[PDB]
Amino acid sequence: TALQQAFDTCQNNKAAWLQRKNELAAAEQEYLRLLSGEGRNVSRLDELRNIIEVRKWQVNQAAGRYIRSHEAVQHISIRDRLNDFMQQHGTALAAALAPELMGYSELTAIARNCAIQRATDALREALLSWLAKGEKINYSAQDSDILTTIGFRPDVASVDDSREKFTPAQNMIFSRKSAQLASRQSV
Amino acid sequence: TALQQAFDTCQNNKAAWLQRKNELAAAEQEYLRLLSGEGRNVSRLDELRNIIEVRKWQVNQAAGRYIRSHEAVQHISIRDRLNDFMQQHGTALAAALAPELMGYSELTAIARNCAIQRATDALREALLSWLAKGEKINYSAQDSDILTTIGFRPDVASVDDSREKFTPAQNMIFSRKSAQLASRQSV
Ligand SMILES: [Hg+2]
Ligand SMILES: [Hg+2]
């Protein structure tokens, strides 16, 4: 399913994000070791300084991509579970909304928009009243394992990491440097 | 119930509106009979001209009041039937919306607004997809007799009748003249 793929991608993206944070930390650590020593490796320091800049960008990109993949999983589940819900109870729901919705398949564009907006306001009010009961809400059983596994929201750390904005021109430079970093043989 | 009262009021208001339209027509008819005759009852004509102006205002007011009472019946039924719906299926609906709604009773004001808006967008999308099936929508069985009796929408005649706007100052004058018209003994 699309949901399963979306979950595999989210899990992959979260790992990539944490991997980048590890790599950055490893570079920061080597840099600091050199700053703390007696030597003065001008070129190694300069190269590490460049690497650190690249890793920060990678952390930022990975964090954003992870957040979007996380939201994608939830978005797909909601859509799909709501479709199943309407399959079971659409008739009763529409019937309750009949004074707004009856004759929908015959309405003009302008009429359909009004009808949907008003039906939507009524639904919102009903949802709000039900929510006020304070009943605890669990995930749909069908998607509970996946939704539980991914967590309710991405950690704020990923939001902090992706806050910085990079232009397309910057992404061009950094994506080039990333590829260069990826083909480096350590020696 | 509030719905039963609202229906009694709608039925009353529709009758009042048609009654006013009859009264106006009766005055217009007497006026025309006089215009078509040989006589020249200056004062009766002038009084009829005044009466006709008052009846037009009454038709306008009654029409508006009828439309609002009709919408009130539908508004109450939708609210009530949706409440019953949530009573039966709220848990499943909320569960399907869990990635948006879970933890709602704990959210800040800003968070609650976002959560409701997003849950509401998802609902709208689900409703739209279900509607695209083109299944015919009937009234909830509980309110079907009342909703059928009142009709889906007020006749456009009532919209035409209430289109004209009257200021509070005009309503003051006309409401006075209406009362005067009501205490007239015909002679
Ligand atoms: Hg994930
Ligand atoms: Hg009515």
Coordinates of C-alpha atoms and ligand atoms in Angstrom, one line a residue:
Chain A
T1 CA 0.0 0.0 0.0
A2 CA 0.9 3.7 -0.2
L3 CA 0.8 3.8 3.6
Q4 CA 3.3 1.0 4.0
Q5 CA 5.7 2.7 1.5
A6 CA 5.2 6.1 3.3
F7 CA 6.1 4.4 6.6
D8 CA 9.2 2.7 5.2
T9 CA 10.2 6.1 3.8
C10 CA 9.6 7.9 7.1
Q11 CA 11.7 5.3 9.0
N12 CA 14.4 5.7 6.4
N13 CA 14.3 9.5 6.6
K14 CA 14.5 9.6 10.3
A15 CA 17.6 7.3 10.2
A16 CA 19.2 9.5 7.6
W17 CA 18.6 12.6 9.8
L18 CA 20.1 11.0 12.9
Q19 CA 23.0 9.7 10.8
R20 CA 23.7 13.2 9.5
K21 CA 23.7 14.6 13.1
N22 CA 26.2 11.8 14.1
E23 CA 28.5 12.7 11.1
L24 CA 28.4 16.4 12.0
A25 CA 29.2 15.6 15.6
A26 CA 32.1 13.4 14.5
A27 CA 33.5 16.2 12.4
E28 CA 33.0 18.8 15.2
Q29 CA 34.8 16.4 17.6
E30 CA 37.8 15.9 15.3
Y31 CA 38.0 19.7 14.7
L32 CA 38.0 20.3 18.5
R33 CA 40.7 17.6 19.1
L34 CA 42.9 19.5 16.7
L35 CA 42.1 22.9 18.3
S36 CA 43.0 21.4 21.6
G37 CA 46.4 19.9 20.5
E38 CA 49.8 21.5 20.0
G39 CA 50.0 21.0 16.3
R40 CA 48.8 23.5 13.7
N41 CA 47.5 21.5 10.7
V42 CA 46.4 24.5 8.7
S43 CA 45.0 22.5 5.8
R44 CA 43.3 19.8 7.8
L45 CA 41.6 22.4 10.0
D46 CA 40.4 24.3 6.9
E47 CA 39.1 21.1 5.3
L48 CA 37.3 20.1 8.6
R49 CA 35.8 23.6 8.7
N50 CA 34.4 23.0 5.2
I51 CA 33.2 19.5 6.1
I52 CA 31.3 20.8 9.1
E53 CA 29.6 23.4 7.0
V54 CA 28.4 20.7 4.6
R55 CA 27.3 18.4 7.4
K56 CA 25.1 21.2 8.9
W57 CA 23.4 21.6 5.6
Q58 CA 22.9 17.9 5.3
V59 CA 21.4 17.8 8.8
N60 CA 19.0 20.7 7.9
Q61 CA 17.9 19.0 4.6
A62 CA 17.5 15.6 6.2
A63 CA 15.4 17.0 9.1
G64 CA 13.0 18.8 6.7
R65 CA 12.6 15.7 4.5
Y66 CA 12.0 13.6 7.6
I67 CA 9.2 15.9 9.0
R68 CA 7.5 15.9 5.6
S69 CA 7.7 12.1 5.3
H70 CA 6.2 11.8 8.9
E71 CA 3.3 14.1 8.0
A72 CA 2.8 12.1 4.8
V73 CA 2.2 8.9 6.7
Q74 CA -0.4 10.6 8.9
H75 CA -2.0 12.3 6.0
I76 CA -2.4 9.0 4.1
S77 CA -3.7 7.1 7.1
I78 CA -6.3 9.8 7.9
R79 CA -7.5 9.9 4.3
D80 CA -7.7 6.1 4.1
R81 CA -9.3 5.5 7.5
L82 CA -11.9 8.3 6.7
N83 CA -12.6 6.6 3.4
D84 CA -13.3 3.3 5.3
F85 CA -15.4 5.3 7.8
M86 CA -17.5 6.8 5.0
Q87 CA -17.9 3.4 3.5
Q88 CA -19.5 2.2 6.7
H89 CA -21.3 5.3 7.8
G90 CA -21.4 7.7 4.9
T91 CA -25.1 7.2 4.4
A92 CA -26.1 8.1 8.0
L93 CA -23.7 11.1 8.0
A94 CA -25.1 12.4 4.7
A95 CA -28.6 11.8 5.9
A96 CA -28.0 13.9 9.0
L97 CA -26.7 16.6 6.6
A98 CA -29.5 16.2 4.1
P99 CA -30.9 19.7 4.4
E100 CA -27.5 20.9 3.2
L101 CA -26.5 18.0 0.9
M102 CA -29.6 16.5 -0.6
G103 CA -29.5 17.0 -4.4
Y104 CA -25.7 17.5 -4.3
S105 CA -25.1 15.6 -7.5
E106 CA -27.4 18.1 -9.3
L107 CA -26.1 21.4 -7.9
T108 CA -24.2 24.1 -9.8
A109 CA -20.6 24.8 -8.9
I110 CA -21.6 27.9 -6.8
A111 CA -24.3 25.8 -5.0
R112 CA -21.9 22.9 -4.4
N113 CA -19.3 25.1 -2.7
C114 CA -21.9 26.7 -0.4
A115 CA -23.4 23.3 0.4
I116 CA -20.0 21.8 1.3
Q117 CA -18.9 24.8 3.3
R118 CA -22.1 24.8 5.4
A119 CA -22.1 21.0 5.8
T120 CA -18.4 21.4 6.9
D121 CA -19.2 24.1 9.5
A122 CA -21.9 21.8 10.9
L123 CA -19.5 18.8 11.1
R124 CA -16.9 20.9 12.8
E125 CA -19.5 22.0 15.4
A126 CA -20.5 18.4 15.9
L127 CA -16.9 17.2 16.3
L128 CA -16.2 20.0 18.8
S129 CA -19.2 19.0 20.9
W130 CA -18.2 15.3 20.9
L131 CA -14.6 16.3 21.7
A132 CA -15.8 18.2 24.8
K133 CA -16.8 14.9 26.3
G134 CA -13.1 14.4 26.8
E135 CA -13.1 10.8 25.6
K136 CA -9.5 9.5 25.0
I137 CA -8.7 9.1 21.4
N138 CA -6.7 6.1 20.1
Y139 CA -5.5 5.3 16.6
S140 CA -7.6 3.3 14.2
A141 CA -6.8 -0.4 14.9
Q142 CA -5.8 -0.9 11.3
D143 CA -3.0 1.7 11.4
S144 CA -2.2 1.7 15.1
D145 CA 1.2 -0.1 14.9
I146 CA 2.5 2.1 12.2
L147 CA 1.2 5.3 13.7
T148 CA 2.4 4.4 17.2
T149 CA 5.8 3.4 15.8
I150 CA 6.3 6.8 14.0
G151 CA 5.3 8.9 17.1
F152 CA 2.6 11.6 17.3
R153 CA 4.9 14.4 16.0
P154 CA 8.5 14.7 14.8
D155 CA 10.8 15.7 17.7
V156 CA 11.2 19.4 18.0
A157 CA 14.9 18.8 17.4
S158 CA 14.0 18.1 13.7
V159 CA 12.1 21.4 13.5
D160 CA 15.0 23.2 15.1
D161 CA 17.4 21.5 12.6
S162 CA 15.4 22.5 9.5
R163 CA 14.5 26.0 10.5
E164 CA 17.4 27.6 8.6
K165 CA 16.4 28.5 5.0
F166 CA 18.7 27.7 2.1
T167 CA 18.3 29.1 -1.4
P168 CA 18.3 26.9 -4.5
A169 CA 21.7 28.4 -5.3
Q170 CA 23.0 27.3 -1.9
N171 CA 21.5 23.9 -2.3
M172 CA 23.2 23.6 -5.6
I173 CA 26.6 24.3 -4.1
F174 CA 26.0 22.1 -1.1
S175 CA 24.6 19.2 -3.1
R176 CA 27.8 19.3 -5.1
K177 CA 30.0 19.4 -2.0
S178 CA 27.9 16.5 -0.5
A179 CA 28.6 14.3 -3.5
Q180 CA 32.3 15.2 -3.2
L181 CA 32.2 14.3 0.5
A182 CA 30.5 11.0 -0.4
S183 CA 33.3 9.8 -2.8
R184 CA 36.1 10.7 -0.4
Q185 CA 38.3 7.7 0.5
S186 CA 39.5 8.1 4.0
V187 CA 43.3 8.0 4.3
Chain B
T1 CA -38.4 19.7 21.6
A2 CA -36.8 22.7 20.1
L3 CA -37.2 21.2 16.7
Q4 CA -41.0 20.7 17.1
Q5 CA -41.4 24.3 18.2
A6 CA -39.2 25.5 15.3
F7 CA -41.4 23.6 12.9
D8 CA -44.6 25.0 14.4
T9 CA -43.2 28.4 14.0
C10 CA -42.1 27.8 10.4
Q11 CA -45.6 26.6 9.5
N12 CA -47.1 29.6 11.3
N13 CA -44.7 32.0 9.5
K14 CA -45.4 30.6 6.1
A15 CA -49.1 31.0 6.6
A16 CA -48.6 34.6 7.8
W17 CA -46.6 35.3 4.6
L18 CA -49.2 33.9 2.3
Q19 CA -51.9 35.7 4.3
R20 CA -50.1 39.0 3.8
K21 CA -49.8 38.3 0.0
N22 CA -53.6 37.7 -0.1
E23 CA -54.4 40.9 1.8
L24 CA -52.1 42.9 -0.5
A25 CA -53.8 41.4 -3.5
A26 CA -57.3 42.1 -2.0
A27 CA -56.3 45.8 -1.6
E28 CA -54.8 46.0 -5.1
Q29 CA -58.0 44.5 -6.5
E30 CA -60.3 47.0 -4.7
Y31 CA -58.0 49.8 -5.8
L32 CA -58.2 48.6 -9.4
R33 CA -62.0 48.3 -9.3
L34 CA -62.2 51.9 -8.2
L35 CA -59.8 53.0 -11.0
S36 CA -62.0 51.2 -13.5
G37 CA -65.2 52.7 -12.4
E38 CA -66.8 56.1 -13.2
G39 CA -66.7 57.5 -9.7
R40 CA -63.9 59.5 -8.2
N41 CA -63.6 58.6 -4.6
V42 CA -60.6 60.8 -3.9
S43 CA -60.3 59.8 -0.2
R44 CA -61.0 56.1 -0.6
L45 CA -58.4 55.9 -3.3
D46 CA -55.8 57.7 -1.2
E47 CA -56.5 55.4 1.8
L48 CA -56.3 52.3 -0.4
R49 CA -53.0 53.6 -1.8
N50 CA -51.8 53.9 1.9
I51 CA -53.1 50.4 2.7
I52 CA -51.3 48.9 -0.3
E53 CA -48.0 50.4 0.8
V54 CA -48.4 48.9 4.3
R55 CA -49.4 45.5 2.9
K56 CA -46.2 45.4 0.7
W57 CA -44.1 46.1 3.8
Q58 CA -45.9 43.3 5.7
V59 CA -45.4 40.9 2.8
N60 CA -41.7 41.8 2.8
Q61 CA -41.3 41.4 6.6
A62 CA -43.3 38.1 6.7
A63 CA -41.3 36.6 3.9
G64 CA -38.0 37.3 5.6
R65 CA -39.2 35.9 8.9
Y66 CA -40.5 32.8 7.2
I67 CA -37.2 32.2 5.4
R68 CA -35.3 32.5 8.7
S69 CA -37.7 30.2 10.5
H70 CA -37.4 27.6 7.7
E71 CA -33.6 27.7 8.0
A72 CA -33.9 27.4 11.8
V73 CA -35.7 24.1 11.5
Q74 CA -33.0 22.7 9.2
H75 CA -30.2 24.1 11.4
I76 CA -31.7 22.5 14.5
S77 CA -32.3 19.1 12.8
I78 CA -28.7 19.0 11.4
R79 CA -27.2 19.8 14.8
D80 CA -29.4 17.3 16.6
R81 CA -29.0 14.4 14.0
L82 CA -25.2 15.0 13.9
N83 CA -25.1 14.9 17.7
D84 CA -26.9 11.5 17.6
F85 CA -24.5 10.4 14.9
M86 CA -21.4 11.3 17.0
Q87 CA -23.1 9.5 19.9
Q88 CA -23.0 6.3 17.8
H89 CA -19.9 6.8 15.7
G90 CA -17.9 9.6 17.3
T91 CA -15.3 7.1 18.6
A92 CA -14.5 5.7 15.2
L93 CA -14.5 9.1 13.5
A94 CA -12.1 10.5 16.1
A95 CA -9.9 7.4 15.8
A96 CA -9.6 7.9 12.1
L97 CA -8.6 11.5 12.8
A98 CA -6.3 10.6 15.7
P99 CA -3.1 11.9 14.2
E100 CA -4.8 15.4 14.2
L101 CA -7.0 15.0 17.3
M102 CA -5.3 12.8 19.8
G103 CA -4.5 14.7 22.9
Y104 CA -7.0 17.4 22.0
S105 CA -8.2 17.8 25.6
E106 CA -4.7 18.9 26.5
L107 CA -3.9 21.2 23.6
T108 CA -3.3 25.0 23.9
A109 CA -5.8 27.3 22.2
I110 CA -3.5 27.8 19.2
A111 CA -3.0 24.1 18.9
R112 CA -6.7 23.3 19.2
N113 CA -7.6 25.7 16.4
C114 CA -5.0 24.2 14.1
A115 CA -6.1 20.7 15.0
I116 CA -9.7 21.4 14.3
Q117 CA -9.1 23.2 11.0
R118 CA -6.9 20.3 9.7
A119 CA -9.3 17.6 10.9
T120 CA -12.1 19.7 9.3
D121 CA -10.2 19.8 5.9
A122 CA -9.8 16.1 6.1
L123 CA -13.5 15.5 6.8
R124 CA -14.5 17.8 3.9
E125 CA -12.3 15.8 1.6
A126 CA -13.8 12.5 2.8
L127 CA -17.3 13.9 2.4
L128 CA -16.5 15.1 -1.1
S129 CA -15.2 11.6 -2.1
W130 CA -18.2 9.9 -0.7
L131 CA -20.5 12.3 -2.4
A132 CA -18.9 11.6 -5.7
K133 CA -20.4 8.1 -5.5
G134 CA -23.7 9.8 -6.3
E135 CA -25.7 7.9 -3.8
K136 CA -29.1 9.5 -3.2
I137 CA -29.4 11.3 0.1
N138 CA -32.6 11.1 2.1
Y139 CA -33.5 12.8 5.4
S140 CA -32.8 11.2 8.7
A141 CA -35.7 8.9 9.5
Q142 CA -36.3 10.7 12.8
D143 CA -36.9 14.1 11.2
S144 CA -38.1 13.1 7.8
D145 CA -41.8 14.0 8.2
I146 CA -41.0 17.5 9.5
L147 CA -38.2 18.1 6.9
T148 CA -40.3 16.8 4.1
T149 CA -43.3 18.9 5.2
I150 CA -41.3 22.1 5.2
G151 CA -39.7 21.5 1.8
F152 CA -36.0 21.7 0.9
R153 CA -35.9 25.4 0.4
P154 CA -38.3 28.3 0.8
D155 CA -39.9 29.2 -2.5
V156 CA -37.9 31.8 -4.4
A157 CA -41.1 34.0 -4.2
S158 CA -40.3 34.5 -0.5
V159 CA -36.8 35.6 -1.4
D160 CA -38.1 38.0 -4.1
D161 CA -40.6 39.3 -1.5
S162 CA -38.0 40.0 1.2
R163 CA -35.3 41.4 -1.1
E164 CA -36.2 45.1 -0.5
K165 CA -34.4 46.6 2.5
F166 CA -36.2 48.7 5.1
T167 CA -34.5 50.9 7.6
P168 CA -35.3 50.8 11.4
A169 CA -36.9 54.2 10.9
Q170 CA -39.1 52.8 8.1
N171 CA -40.0 49.7 10.1
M172 CA -41.0 52.1 13.0
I173 CA -43.4 54.0 10.8
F174 CA -44.8 50.9 9.1
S175 CA -45.2 48.9 12.3
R176 CA -47.2 51.8 13.6
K177 CA -49.4 51.8 10.5
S178 CA -49.8 48.0 10.6
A179 CA -51.2 48.3 14.1
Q180 CA -53.6 51.0 13.0
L181 CA -54.6 48.8 10.1
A182 CA -55.2 45.9 12.5
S183 CA -57.7 47.8 14.7
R184 CA -59.7 49.1 11.8
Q185 CA -63.4 48.1 11.9
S186 CA -64.6 47.7 8.4
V187 CA -67.7 49.8 7.5
Ligands
HG1 HG 9.3 7.5 11.0
HG2 HG -42.7 25.7 7.1

